[PDB]
Structure formats: C-alpha cells, structure tokens
Design a protein around this ligand. Structure first.
Ligand SMILES: Nc1ncnc2c1ncn2[C@@H]1O[C@H](COP(=O)(O)OP(=O)(O)OP(=O)(O)O)[C@@H](O)[C@H]1O
Ligand SMILES: [Mg+2]
Ligand SMILES: [Zn+2]
Ligand SMILES: [Zn+2]
Lengths: 178, 15, 379, 138, 182
C-alpha cells in the first residue's frame, strides 16, 4: 500500500496528488495540484517544506540506463526542513538540506545533492550532477552563474499564514494518525 | 460585484 | 552655449558622452540589433556599400542619441573622435549621417592621438593606440601630428581573439555534461566573439619579459629540455551553463605573445614605437622618447605596460637601434582616465572649449554648400 | 502587436527613402497627405522619467544628475533594480542575491537618501586642465 | 494577419451570464473570491488561486492553458498577509505562464513560457517576450518590451497598441466558438 500517513499539522490538500509510500513532516504545507510521485522508493520530507502548485517531485528510476541496479534500489529521497518549492519546480535530487528554496520553473537533476542554504534561480536547469556548496545562488537561464551568498533566509511566516487560510477554503487530507 | 462562484452556480442552475 | 556631445566609434566599443565630463557617460559594443538575426551586426564596417553603412550608422547614432544621451541631436555640437588614416568613405558617410539626417550644428573630426595628448597637459609625445583592429603609433610634436613618421601593425584585439580561438580549438577540453564528463575536444565548431573576449579579458595576462622570452624560445624547443616556465593553473570557464571549457594554463600566458613575437621580420608592438621614433626628425627624438602615451583597450591587459617597457629597453640594445636610440630614457605617461577612454577624455576637454569649437568644427551650412568634408588628403 | 503578424502586410512609404513597414509602425501626417515612416520622421526628447519609480524629471535635473534617478539603483551583477531591505538598510537584488554587503558599503540609517556614488579621483586635475585649455582657447 | 480559428468542445467549458468562458479543467480555487468582469477566457489546466486574496480580472482578457494566476505574498512591517491581485481589461496571457504580479494594467500581453516575480507591477500597454523571467519588485513602464533572463527593457511597442490589442483580444473572443456537435 502507498502509505500516505503524514505527521499531524500537515495541510496537504486532497487536490494535491501524492502517490507511493510517502513520508512528510508535521509542519509541511502542500498546495493543490502539487505532484509527489514515489515509484522507486519512499520519500521523506521534513517539517516546514512548503510545496507550491505545479511542483512535480518524482523519485523515478533512472531511465537513462535502467540496469536493475541492486534489484529494487530503494534510494529514499530525504528532504530537509524550512524549504520552499515554488510553482512549476521540477525537483529530482535525492538529498536536500534545510533552508532550501527553488524558484519557479526550475529543473533539479536526479544525481544532484542540495546542501544547506542553496537557492536555485527561476528558469534554470541542473542536469549536471555535483554537490552544491553551502549558500550558493544559481541564477540565469543562459548559464548557471553560481554565486556565493552571505546567509540564507526562511519563509516561516508565510507558511504559518498559509496554515491559517488554507483549510477554510480547501479540504486538507484527513490523514489518520501515523 | 458578481463573484465567479455565483456565475458557476447560475450556469449549473441553467443546465 | 549648450554642452557639445562627444562620440568615439570603434569596432569593439563605442564611447559616448558629454564635453567637460570626468569620463564617458556611455560605453557600449558597436553593434545594432536588427530584428530576425540572432547575432547583431557590426556598425563600423569598412569596404561595404554606402547605403548599408548609412543605415547602420543611422540606427546606431539614433540609439546613442535617444537611449544613452537623453537630448536632442539638433541642439548640441558633436566632437567625433576618428583615428588618423581612418577610411575616407566611412568618414564622409558618418558626417553625411550626422548632417543630412540628424541636422547637428557641426561635427569636429578630431584625431584620437592628439586628443589623447591633450588629457595629460603636455604638447608632445609618442601616442600608441592599441585598438581592436590594429595597433597604431603616431608622434605628436607641439600639437602637430607627424603623419610622415606613422606606424601600424595588425596586432590589436582582433588578432588576439583569433589566436585565442585557434589555441582553444587545438587544446580544447570541454565537459559537455551529457554523458561526456571526460574531455570532448571541439564539441562546438567556432567559439563566439563574446566568449573569446570574456576569456581574454578575464583569464589571459601578459607575462614578464624573461618569462615571455623563455616561452617564445621553448615554442621552437630546438634541442630544449623543459625550458618553458611553469605555467599558471588551468581555469574552468563555464560555457552555456552545462559546458565547462578547461582553458589550459599555457594558453593564458602564451596567447598574448603574438603581440611581442618578432618572427624574422623585426615587427611587434614594442618594436613599432622604436621604428616610428627612428624615422622622426633628429631634434624631436628625445622629447618623444621621454614622453610615451599608451591608449587602447588592449593596453589595459594586466602586465601589458611592464612587458612593453621592458621589451622597448631590450630591443633598444639591439644593433639596429643601438647606434641611434641606444642612450635614451623611455618613460610612460599615466593619464587621468583609463586607457579605454583617454581619447574620449581628450575630446571631452576639447568640447568644452566653446569659443574655438565653433570655428574649428565644420558648420552644417558649409556642408550643405559644398558637401566636401575636410581631410588631410589633397583637395 | 505580434499576436497578429503585422510584418506580413507591409505598406510602402513615399519620400527620399523608400521603406516598406507594417501599417501600425507608420504615421499619417494630415498636412502632408503622404504617410510618413519612423525613419523619415524626426525624433525629439519630450521628458525624462525613471522607469523603476515612474517620476518625471525635468531636463535641467536630468543634466545635473547625469541622466540617472536619484533613488533607484541597478544591480551590477545583473541589470535589475536593487531593492532596499532592513535588518539599518542595505541594497539586495531580486534575481541574484547580490547584497550591498558584498562590495562593502556600510548600512545607511536612512532608507533612500543615504546611498551615494564615489567621487572621481581625477576630477580636480580635470578641472585644472579644462580651465587652462579654456584660457588658452580664449 | 487575422486571428485564426481556435475551436473548443462545448462539453468542457462553462459560459456564464457575463460571458466568461471558463474551462472545466481549469483549477479554480476560492471561486467565491475570484471576480471576472465578463467575456473572459480561462483555458484548461488554468490554476487561478483565489483562496489567498481577491483575484479580480477585467473584460475580454485571455488566460491560455497551463497558466497559474497566484496572488503574491508581501511581508509588511506590521505583519504578514497576501496582496490582492488585479488585472485590467484586455490582457492576453499566453500558455505556460506564471503570474505573481501585484497589478497588471490593461492592454498587456505576456509571452508564452513566462514567469513574473512576486509583487511585480505591469503598467498598461506593455509586452513580455517569450521565455522571460521578471524578478520580484520589477516595474514595467508602458510601451516597453521586457525580454530576457532577467527581463530588461529592450524596445518600445508601436503607437497604436491600445487599438491593436483591443482588436486582437476581441477577435480572439469572437473566433473562440464551440466545436460543431456533428
Ligand atoms: N577593461 C578592459 N580590459 C582589458 N581588455 C579590454 C578592456 N576593455 C576592452 N578591452 C579589449 O580591448 C580591445 C578593444 O579596445 P578599444 O576599446 O580601445 O578599441 P575600439 O575603440 O573599439 O577600436 P578601434 O580603435 O580599433 O576602432 C578588445 O580586445 C577588448 O576586448
Ligand atoms: Mg581606441
Ligand atoms: Zn527611480
Ligand atoms: Zn542582480
């Protein structure tokens, strides 16, 4: 069974598509039409990672080779805390650090590792694989233009306000106790 | 003003 | 009287602004973006039909006068800085564009070298302009450009970009990132001019005299055993996002050696000044040797001036120049403006001289009456 | 404009220069019955306004301030309007996270007016030179 | 060049009293809060997020498919809230668009595959070329094209944009007639 059990406090809407044995933290918010597909293995999401609109997170088995590596090859996707997944983001990184925001209409490669404080600019692609250093902003569509940043910045107040306003308009998924 | 929900309800009523 | 505008057109960059200013307000690539064509067209092109050049100059000057200078063209005079021995047809086409279309009051076709001289306050020096298209040496003695002793070589930024492209295409090692993390030489047929320019300005540098000579000798490597100096570390220049061109360390200091390489002809950037000086009048030499002014974008490369002065002093001792220019003290000037816009700064200083600028410049009434622009060719 | 392909239909404009252009890009002088093109017509500057803060600027102020807005700043990494942020204020860009702290400009207590451009080092010698050449020109 | 025909199946659309033609597949959220002024076209897979703040949209505007109208979030000193989104009359939003603009004026045309940053202000008669990102707090003045990544002023629209655009949007509405139920 694709267990959709989520910790208390989640504001995932029934319109937001989630499939596979997912795992989401308590304070995470998920907006309608967010897609979280977990076909290769379970997805672990920490507290505060808000998901917006057309955010397609697929833990898809690599079709570039597909050699049946290690039989099932679970490879659980671990996602940090106090993260932001803006509209149109297309994330596939297996590991994500806390304080991570990816701007709208961004591609994240399967083999990329996202560390703490990193930011992905809008209309950018990260098909190339490597670990992102801390507090690295990637901006521009012509190229990547990696630039070091002095500090990160969370969006907790927006998440709290969303927790206030969302359940009045949309019916959150009435997940039973984990 | 006529909210879009009201227009949708009126369209449903017409059907 | 309203402040006169100043324009300095060049193949690589055009410098624009107002007179009596500490520096140019605008400095942009000399291109115009025509619709439908991805890579824009060079505004200043020699040996083309006059209609196309007229249209290009019209569009570019309109961009200058209504995007960068926020002022009408009719009101204010113009001080156009054009290099000596500029192609004639381009010059009369430019003046025709300025007069017939924009109806400016008057355009002063000042020479770049004399204007560059005006910035320092001196009235005599050997001005070398290392432009994009070619390097050009001209001596000025008491405000009189000595055209008889001119010199020029095609060792500007264009030749340097071509050499950089050739060396990169030879020692190409680019990580495409799509199942090509290993070196994949010459994945792209030709590098665009912008990428070459950025690589040249950012990575490449001019090595010391001794290191440069050792590099030149080790290029032949006739019976040599690792005589080259140890190169700087390689630099991984990103292209197009995913691609990463591993610009080799050797290129970074060997690409610019074409400027200073003799190659069995005794012609280089450094030797150019000595060749011009040896042709000068006997009395003018010393004042021209002690006053050297270097301008142009290529001269702004790091370590260029030190290598140039060292090469000058090195070539002075050679038998060709030992008899005449042997016991001379060369000294470089440091004008207030950056070497990109020293000529523009001279034109700007000349622009605020409102009283003379009316008489020296060519009035539009005179151009309409005659249609012949003054030039140092026979009239 | 581009939704309907205006370039498909090209009207010719009479005059010294024969130019074919879309009808939307042509102007019809009523005193001269022949319609006139954008290349044939003469352009003049009517007013200056800052695109970020849509404040009209008089021409004298434009000359004094060197055709630059008094408040807005353009980010150097990418030509985008820098935004003031408070912790006691500093400029930070929206697209790339270029902050004023990177180049090392101390935080200004006031919101907008604190920030200023450096003075050109060679402005004094420029004034000396221009004065000398002015008297020589005289 | 006139606007070509673009037929739609009548089953998956709702025509309203005011004349809005809103697709069934469009993701309307907080529809009690959304307001359309009439003659509006909302295509399939349009995510109009009215559950956060007042999203009012003017007459004859076109919101092509796979376009999201999400009001922006502003963090003011007194606290936090969501700014209402306002769109003027005769706005042509191309498909695969992302709109976080505080205000879009009238006679505006957003190119296809475009993302507009938070709290952007688009004045009347402005264009955004395709594959363009407007970072937050970007103000587009009237009669200007904002193109590139980031969007930078790179041209001016013709004189008759107020007339051409109101012709184009009206033609688009008049040519968006339902399929023949044969
Ligand atoms: N700041 C800089 N540092 C290093 N190189 C530079 C710099 N600015 C320009 N260049 C290079 O200098 C050359 C352009 O020189 P410059 O701007 O003086 O020429 P130009 O006026 O456009 O041309 P020309 O005088 O031949 O008409 C090009 O190689 C450009 O890459
Ligand atoms: Mg030059
Ligand atoms: Zn401003
Ligand atoms: Zn920036």
């Amino acid at each position: 069974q694709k267990s959709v059990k989520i910790a208390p406090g989640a504001v995932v809407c029934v319109e937001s598509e989630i499939r596979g044995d997912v795992t989401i933290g308590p304070r995470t918010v998920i907006h309608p039409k967010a897609r979280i597909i977990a076909e290769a293995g379970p997805i672990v999401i920490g507290e505060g990672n808000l998901i917006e609109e057309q955010a397609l997170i697929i833990n898809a088995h690599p079709d570039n080779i597909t050699p049946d590596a290690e039989d099932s090859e679970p490879k659980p996707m671990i996602i940090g805390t106090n993260n932001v997944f803006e509209v149109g983001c297309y994330s596939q990184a297996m590991k994500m650090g806390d304080n991570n925001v990816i701007e709208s209409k961004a591609y994240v490669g399967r083999n990329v590792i996202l560390t703490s404080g990193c930011i992905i600019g809008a209309c950018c692609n990260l098909n190339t694989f490597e670990v992102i250093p801390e507090n690295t902003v990637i901006y521009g569509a012509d190229c990547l233009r990696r630039v070091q940043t002095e500090r990160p910045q969370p969006q907790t107040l927006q998440l709290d306000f969303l927790m206030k306003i969302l359940p009045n308009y949309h019916h959150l998924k009435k997940t039973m106790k984990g | 003003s006529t909210s879009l929900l009201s227009e949708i309800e009126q369209s449903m009523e017409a059907e | 009287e309203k402040t006169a505008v100043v324009i300095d057109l060049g193949e690589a960059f055009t410098k624009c602004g107002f007179a009596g200013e500490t520096g140019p307000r605008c400095i942009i690539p000399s291109v115009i973006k025509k619709a439908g064509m991805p890579k824009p067209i060079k505004v200043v092109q020699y040996n083309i039909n006059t209609e196309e050049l007229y249209s290009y100059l019209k569009e570019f000057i309109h961009i200058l006068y209504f995007r960068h200078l926020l002022v009408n063209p009719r009101d204010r005079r113009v001080v156009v800085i054009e290099s000596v021995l500029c192609p004639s047809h381009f010059r009369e086409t430019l003046t025709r564009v300025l007069f017939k279309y924009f109806e400016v009051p008057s355009v002063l076709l000042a020479p770049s070298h004399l204007m560059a001289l005006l910035t320092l306050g001196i009235n005599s020096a050997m001005v070398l302009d290392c432009g994009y298209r070619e390097s050009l040496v001209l001596p000025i003695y008491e405000g009189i450009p000595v055209l008889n002793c001119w010199g020029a070589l095609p060792l500007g930024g264009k030749a340097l970009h071509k050499e950089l492209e050739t060396q990169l295409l030879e020692q190409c090692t680019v990580d495409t990132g799509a199942a090509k993390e290993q070196s994949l030489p010459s994945v792209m047929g030709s590098i665009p001019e912008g990428v070459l320019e950025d690589i040249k300005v950012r990575t490449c540098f001019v090595s010391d005299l001794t290191r440069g000579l050792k590099i030149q000798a080790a290029k032949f490597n006739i019976d040599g055993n690792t005589e080259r100096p140890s190169p700087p570390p390689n630099v991984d220049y990103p292209l197009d996002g995913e691609k990463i061109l591993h610009v080799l360390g050797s290129i970074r200091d060997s690409v610019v050696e074409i400027l200073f390489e003799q190659d069995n002809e005794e012609k280089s950037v450094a030797t150019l000044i000595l060749d011009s000086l040896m042709q000068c009048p006997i009395d003018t030499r010393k004042q021209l040797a002690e006053n050297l002014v270097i301008i142009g974008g290529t001269s702004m490369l790091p370590g260029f001036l030190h290598r140039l002065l060292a090469e000058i002093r090195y070539l002075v001792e050679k038998p060709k120049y030992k008899k005449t220019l042997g016991t001379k003290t060369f000294r470089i000037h440091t004008p207030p403006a950056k070497a990109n816009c020293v000529a523009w700064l001279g034109g700007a200083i000349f622009g605020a001289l409102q009283d003379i600028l009316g008489s020296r410049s060519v009035s539009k009434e005179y151009y309409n009456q005659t249609g012949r622009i003054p030039d140092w060719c026979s009239l | 404009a581009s939704l309907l392909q205006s370039e498909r239909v090209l009207y010719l404009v009479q005059g010294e220069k024969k130019v074919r252009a879309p009808l939307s890009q042509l102007y019809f002088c009523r005193y001269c019955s022949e319609l006139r093109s954008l290349e044939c017509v003469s352009h003049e500057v009517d007013s200056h306004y800052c695109p970020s803060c849509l404040e009209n600027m008089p021409s004298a102020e434009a000359k004094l301030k060197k055709n630059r807005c008094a408040n807005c700043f353009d980010c150097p990494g990418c030509m985008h309007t820098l935004s003031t942020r408070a912790t006691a204020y500093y400029l930070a860009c929206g697209f790339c996270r270029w902050t004023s702290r990177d180049v090392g400009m101390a935080d200004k207590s006031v919101a907008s007016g604190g920030w200023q451009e450096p003075d050109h080092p060679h402005t004094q010698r420029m004034n000396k030179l221009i004065e000398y050449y002015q008297q020589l020109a005289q | 060049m006139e606007l070509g025909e673009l037929l739609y199946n009548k089953s998956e659309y709702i025509e309203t009293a005011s004349g809005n033609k809103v697709s069934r597949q469009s993701v309307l959220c907080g529809s009690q809060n959304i307001v359309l002024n009439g003659k509006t076209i909302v295509m399939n897979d349009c995510i109009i997020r009215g559950d956060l703040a007042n999203v009012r949209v003017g007459r004859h505007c076109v919101v092509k498919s796979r376009s999201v109208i999400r009001p922006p979030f502003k963090k003011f000193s007194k606290g936090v809230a969501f700014f209402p989104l306002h769109i003027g009359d005769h706005v042509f939003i191309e498909e695969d668009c992302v709109v976080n603009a505080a205000q879009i004026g009238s006679y505006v045309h957003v190119g296809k595959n475009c993302v507009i940053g938070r709290r952007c202000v688009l004045k009347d008669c402005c264009k955004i070329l395709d594959n363009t990102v407007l970072p937050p707090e970007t103000v587009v003045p009237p009669f200007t094209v904002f193109s590139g990544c980031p969007g930078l002023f790179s041209g001016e629209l013709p004189e008759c944009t107020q007339e051409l655009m109101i012709d184009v949007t009206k033609s688009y509405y008049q040519k968006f007639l339902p399929l023949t139920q044969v």
